[PDB]
Write a protein that binds this ligand. Sequence first.
Ligand SMILES: *[C@@H]1O[C@H](CO)[C@@H](O)[C@H](O[C@@H]2O[C@H](CO)[C@@H](O)[C@H](O)[C@H]2NC(C)=O)[C@H]1NC(C)=O
Ligand SMILES: *[C@@H]1O[C@H](CO)[C@@H](O)[C@H](O[C@@H]2O[C@H](CO)[C@@H](O)[C@H](O)[C@H]2NC(C)=O)[C@H]1NC(C)=O
Ligand SMILES: *[C@@H]1O[C@H](CO)[C@@H](O)[C@H](O[C@@H]2O[C@H](CO)[C@@H](O)[C@H](O)[C@H]2NC(C)=O)[C@H]1NC(C)=O
Ligand SMILES: *[C@H]1O[C@H](CO)[C@@H](O[C@@H]2O[C@H](CO)[C@@H](O)[C@H](O)[C@H]2NC(C)=O)[C@H](O)[C@H]1NC(C)=O
Ligand SMILES: *[C@H]1O[C@H](CO)[C@@H](O[C@@H]2O[C@H](CO)[C@@H](O)[C@H](O)[C@H]2NC(C)=O)[C@H](O)[C@H]1NC(C)=O
Ligand SMILES: *[C@H]1O[C@H](CO)[C@@H](O[C@@H]2O[C@H](CO)[C@@H](O)[C@H](O)[C@H]2NC(C)=O)[C@H](O)[C@H]1NC(C)=O
Ligand SMILES: *[C@@H]1O[C@H](CO)[C@@H](O)[C@H](O)[C@H]1NC(C)=O
Ligand SMILES: *[C@@H]1O[C@H](CO)[C@@H](O)[C@H](O)[C@H]1NC(C)=O
Ligand SMILES: *[C@@H]1O[C@H](CO)[C@@H](O)[C@H](O)[C@H]1NC(C)=O
Lengths: 321, 321, 321, 162, 162, 162
Amino acid sequence: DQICIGYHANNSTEQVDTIMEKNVTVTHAQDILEKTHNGKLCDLDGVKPLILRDCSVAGWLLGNPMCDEFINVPEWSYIVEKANPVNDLCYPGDFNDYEELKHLLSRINHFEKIQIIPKSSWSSHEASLGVSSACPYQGKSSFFRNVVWLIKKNSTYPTIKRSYNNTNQEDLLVLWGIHHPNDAAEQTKLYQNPTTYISVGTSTLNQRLVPRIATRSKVNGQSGRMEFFWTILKPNDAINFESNGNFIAPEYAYKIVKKGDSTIMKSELEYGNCNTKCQTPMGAINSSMPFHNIHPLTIGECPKYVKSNRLVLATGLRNSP
Amino acid sequence: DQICIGYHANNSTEQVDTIMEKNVTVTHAQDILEKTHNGKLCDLDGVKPLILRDCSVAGWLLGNPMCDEFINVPEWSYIVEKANPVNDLCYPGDFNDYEELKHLLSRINHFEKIQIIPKSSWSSHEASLGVSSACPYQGKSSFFRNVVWLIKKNSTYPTIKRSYNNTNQEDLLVLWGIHHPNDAAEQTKLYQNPTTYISVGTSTLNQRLVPRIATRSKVNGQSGRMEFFWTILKPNDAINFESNGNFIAPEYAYKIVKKGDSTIMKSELEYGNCNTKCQTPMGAINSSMPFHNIHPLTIGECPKYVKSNRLVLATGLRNSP
Amino acid sequence: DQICIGYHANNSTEQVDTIMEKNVTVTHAQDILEKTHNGKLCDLDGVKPLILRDCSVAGWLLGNPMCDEFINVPEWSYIVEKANPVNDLCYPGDFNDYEELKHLLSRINHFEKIQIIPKSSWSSHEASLGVSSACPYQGKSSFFRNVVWLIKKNSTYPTIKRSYNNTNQEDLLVLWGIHHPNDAAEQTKLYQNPTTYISVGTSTLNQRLVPRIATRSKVNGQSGRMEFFWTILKPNDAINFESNGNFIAPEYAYKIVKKGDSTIMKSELEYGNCNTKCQTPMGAINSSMPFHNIHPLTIGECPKYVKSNRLVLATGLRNSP
Amino acid sequence: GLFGAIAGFIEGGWQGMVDGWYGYHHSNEQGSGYAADKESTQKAIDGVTNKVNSIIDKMNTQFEAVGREFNNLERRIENLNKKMEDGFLDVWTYNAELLVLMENERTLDFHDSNVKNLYDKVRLQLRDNAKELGNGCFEFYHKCDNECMESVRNGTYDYPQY
Amino acid sequence: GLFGAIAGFIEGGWQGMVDGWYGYHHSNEQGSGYAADKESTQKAIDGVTNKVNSIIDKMNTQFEAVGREFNNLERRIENLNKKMEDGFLDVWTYNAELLVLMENERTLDFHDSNVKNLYDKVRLQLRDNAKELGNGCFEFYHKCDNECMESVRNGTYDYPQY
Amino acid sequence: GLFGAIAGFIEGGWQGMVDGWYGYHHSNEQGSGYAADKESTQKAIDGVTNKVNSIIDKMNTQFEAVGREFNNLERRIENLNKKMEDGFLDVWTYNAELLVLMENERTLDFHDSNVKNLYDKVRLQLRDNAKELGNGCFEFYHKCDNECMESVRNGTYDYPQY
Ligand SMILES: *[C@@H]1O[C@H](CO)[C@@H](O)[C@H](O[C@@H]2O[C@H](CO)[C@@H](O)[C@H](O)[C@H]2NC(C)=O)[C@H]1NC(C)=O
Ligand SMILES: *[C@@H]1O[C@H](CO)[C@@H](O)[C@H](O[C@@H]2O[C@H](CO)[C@@H](O)[C@H](O)[C@H]2NC(C)=O)[C@H]1NC(C)=O
Ligand SMILES: *[C@@H]1O[C@H](CO)[C@@H](O)[C@H](O[C@@H]2O[C@H](CO)[C@@H](O)[C@H](O)[C@H]2NC(C)=O)[C@H]1NC(C)=O
Ligand SMILES: *[C@H]1O[C@H](CO)[C@@H](O[C@@H]2O[C@H](CO)[C@@H](O)[C@H](O)[C@H]2NC(C)=O)[C@H](O)[C@H]1NC(C)=O
Ligand SMILES: *[C@H]1O[C@H](CO)[C@@H](O[C@@H]2O[C@H](CO)[C@@H](O)[C@H](O)[C@H]2NC(C)=O)[C@H](O)[C@H]1NC(C)=O
Ligand SMILES: *[C@H]1O[C@H](CO)[C@@H](O[C@@H]2O[C@H](CO)[C@@H](O)[C@H](O)[C@H]2NC(C)=O)[C@H](O)[C@H]1NC(C)=O
Ligand SMILES: *[C@@H]1O[C@H](CO)[C@@H](O)[C@H](O)[C@H]1NC(C)=O
Ligand SMILES: *[C@@H]1O[C@H](CO)[C@@H](O)[C@H](O)[C@H]1NC(C)=O
Ligand SMILES: *[C@@H]1O[C@H](CO)[C@@H](O)[C@H](O)[C@H]1NC(C)=O
């Protein structure tokens, strides 16, 4: 008669690594790294992303006429932009402090666009002739829909002195621009006056832009340039504009209704008609694992990102052959 | 007869955590995390902090007339500034490269203020009429005490051509400013000349400021703006000023006598009449522990900051019930 | 008769540390920290570094006449620059976005210098009188060899309108400059016209520099200043220059033939006639160890840098006395 | 293994013992069978469960990357940013991989130790009333029916009785 | 515990042994008492002391935060800065908490091992001149007065004598 | 040491055993000598070799510094940069030093455990056919010639034969 002490064995082929020994077969193990995703861009807890498609943030916000889809967009969970959107600045130029503005959108879930300076309001200047073949719409010359490229009227561009008071409760994002023409002949042909400026003031802003004349390479058939600027107008503050010419005036500006957790995600993927708790640029994650290795840039309630190919904890003991 | 092997037990209720078991009672343990502080701002090894109270660094350095307390301040261990000091720029404006200058003060323990351009020295301009109701002192209009707001004399602002040679041994911090008025009418009313500038040169500096005219929101009852600039004048170098008008001229500048370990600490707390080896924004630390969890921003000989709520090492063994 | 179980001992005096015990003598051990280097700057896998010697990157690229050694330099593995090179800007000034350009060279192994605007090409201006005693060459006044300091001809500086088309396949680095003179008398003495500018345009660049007049400290006997600028001209793009005066025009520009892994290493050491797989600012590394403690800034196939004075793993067992 | 039981003096495990990690096998005139030791098994389950939850939880706070953009003449800080984010990933990847390696090794040794301790607990009961065979088993000097066997599994083996 | 002595085959500790971590209790016709084993206790004190000083010291060099300010249009680098400083805190908080967890576990097992080793050192002296009771105690076959007991504590138990 | 063999119940090592880490020494009327246990030695070599390659390799990906320059009015980011690079060095220096400390301790204990296991493997063969001397040695009750000794080293000691 005998009694023996022993231990469990089973048919498991799960393996775990140790410092001293790789690929040790164990009776029980627990994977802790999520390796799969659904390959789609999805709503984040029921809230759909803003998918800019072929538009850039600039094309969107300025109102590039190829970006009408994103006129008055609803609340978003996150934004998705392609690596090189084709519909950016249809008329060539620069967007001033563009990256700082993008950073600002990482903290915004909703804009509500409003008209601050009506287009009909311009009784002394031509407000409907500021269009270019570089910004076409349905076969015709058009322009950024949210700003008005003002030009002379009966060979006079008289000084502009306008104000908008931010009466509403919500911080207001205001865009304007300046036009840099090719030469002295084009300056007088559009704005009459040879030497011009645009002065812009708020409680914090003290700006005075002057057009910069130079012969440039053609981009989209245009050698002139448009330089766009912005500020955040606080509630109960006012912005004043003064200009001789070259002024690309606000018409519509954006009301910052909802602030919160957002991100500008960079991806070529389109909408995948789905919902998820955790989104990455390559697809959505649905797991209970503490770790994943899909992509570092995630949004939502996500596992922690590691560069590992494999993370498996031993729970059981060394399985017998 | 017998002999037994055994181990110590006692009445300890100290507990320690392990990977596999939480709250294990042990006979002996050693806490290594300091959790307490005295809730005060103190001298650092006998050397009192510069407590700016309701003044900002700018209000202090420019000499905002509400900040007289900090005229000629003695050597400091560290500086303490509130989150939103009320006495900043009494006349509204901007302080150019303000954050870079603040960073410079993190390496300075002492200034010695000296007069480089006497106020009496201005024989061709009015040097005592540059005052505003936005910078009041004892019921009357005043101004930043360290710079002189020069204005016209008998309807003439003749060109200014001044130099200061840094003859002393110690790097010199020099402040000046430019005034941006509301309109062309105010330009001529103060400085006569319509188009003005301020040129500033050193061995390294090549600056030429021009006033920027625009209608702005009133701040402290003023729609004009003052823009302040600075440089570090090395020993044996000279700074030259040239101006038509709008020039806010140095009177006093700061001699950098002592360089060393300092910090600009942000805190609402006032002086606590105490001394300490380790100071944090929330209070001073007096401990021998290797770790603490009060605040990451410390100055002096301090334990190492962690986010832990508890760090207790087992020294003894598992205590019996 | 007996049989005993035992373990190896030997005459080893190697020691290893543990948590609980320092300096434990072991029978066998394995050092894993490389502590030595050869104290020299060497070729990296047969490819010699660009050793700028007493020249800065600016002196090199602009063509400071003391830096002729580095006219048309061959491909390099890495660049070596002293902490304070004496031959920088021989005529005093600034190099605009100098640090961003240096960063660009960390990704370049080879330039091929080419002539884009011939010096003989300037039929309306004096192209061979733009020389200073601050940039001497063989006892005579000279200047940055890669740019041409254009001055008036028979008391006329007519407007300049030049273009260069980047026809070649490789990105082109283009340098130009502007001269900031001491006074109005010197402006007319060099360029005739009192008010001047330099306009510069590419598909992306929209620049218009104006000279800035001020009295400055003499540096290298000069109170005037030269401000140097640059851009990267993409293939098939063109750069246009327009100027009244003060224009320091390109003659030679740099063709970016080879991009790759480089670094600007800071060191006072000269060439050591050697080859190595791993280079540091203090000397080259030749080891199989996973770690070293020479210097954090290395280039090539190197061990991993740690601040340790000693890293020794136990392999054997506790050696008996 | 450090404790010498698992794949040591006990050559291999038991496919036949299904209801626990460690236990006993008996053999007498009445038959034979496997019985799990519930106390040592549950102890093992509690320890390993706490280890997993400890690991999951310590990794809870850890670096999160954020999209940050820079223009064509902000290369230096773009590079600083990329380095900083990559650096933390490498640190956290290392922490995760090393922790798993180190604790897996300890988990295997933990099981080994539990087997050795259960073997000793039995050995210390039986004393010189059984031959220690050297393979995990004890051969009794007396006959040992199911009630006898159960008393060894109890903690109750009455040594002065046999 | 890994070594099976503390709260294992030795059920609990001794409130009555005050002058050391590990030691002996004797029982003979002359009386009874606790005596600490000085060598194994001092060994334990040296190891744990070095462990604490090792831990304190490895943590000596560690990230220090610094006040850094940025304006309203330097948000990106302000955020980079905040992320960088927070990231290092999280890394160092993790290092501190994990080290304490891991080494606490080793400290407890270390003590267990010291008890087991002291028990074996006694066992290996007495050999078959005493009954191994299974609870930490050895019952002598011969009588064992205070001088006899002291020789077991000595390392000197003369086995061929008894 | 945790396992009590090395510099414990086996007082010291053998200068005379040159061909392995652990083994046997015999003594009979025919002579005496050292013989290495090849299995336990090779096991020890494999484990320690894998440990070193594991350590080297986990440290493979690790922070690399890069030269980055800033001008006189970019002090804040210059300082951020210096802090960031220094911070990672301190983290990686800590990881390297701690790993070496921790694993060195485990390597020494590993060897201790291998000796103890080899001693037990012999003990469990000989059972009551030899006196356990308490110092690593077993004195045989029967005579034990070189063939007998070899069978103990074999795993083959025929206990019912003696
Ligand atoms: C327009 O903006 C001005 C300042 O730029 C702002 O003060 C106005 O609000 C009102 O100004 C009044 C001064 O004339 C003041 O008496 C009143 O308290 C203030 N209203 C509020 C809510 O603060 C703005 N215009 C409005 C609100 O119609
Ligand atoms: C004023 O600043 C100038 C340069 O901006 C400086 O050189 C002066 O110092 C002296 O200049 C003399 C040239 O005229 C020179 O001969 C003398 O060595 C130099 N002194 C020193 C100590 O270097 C400055 N003015 C002074 C010192 O009165
Ligand atoms: C010079 O630069 C212009 C644009 O700045 C560039 O387009 C030229 O290349 C050619 O331009 C032609 C238009 O007149 C076009 O028909 C031709 O396809 C194009 N060549 C290439 C290779 O794209 C540049 N000049 C040249 C190449 O001589
Ligand atoms: C463990 O088992 C032993 C033997 O099975 C138990 O003792 C018996 O218990 C049963 C039921 O209580 C009685 O009917 C018998 O008379 C006992 N016989 C013998 C030989 O002991 C004992 O009760 C159990 N102890 C435990 C679970 O601690
Ligand atoms: C340990 O104790 C034993 C017994 O107490 C010691 O042997 C005795 O020592 C005393 C004092 O030296 C003598 O008077 C006795 O004659 C000895 N008697 C016996 C029975 O041994 C021994 O000296 C001690 N050994 C140590 C401390 O190593
Ligand atoms: C280990 O050694 C024993 C004794 O040396 C071996 O048994 C002997 O083997 C030799 C050669 O095969 C024979 O000539 C003898 O007749 C055997 N004698 C005895 C007393 O056993 C055994 O073969 C070896 N076993 C191994 C290596 O597993
Ligand atoms: C361990 O297993 C994996 C996959 O099953 C294999 O690729 C690898 O080579 C093995 N490693 C070792 C060290 O044997
Ligand atoms: C451990 O003790 C603490 C405080 O005494 C208590 O809050 C906590 O819930 C306990 N944890 C566990 C896992 O039992
Ligand atoms: C260990 O050895 C080194 C050098 O041999 C010596 O400097 C050091 O003081 C010793 N450390 C301890 C703790 O004894």
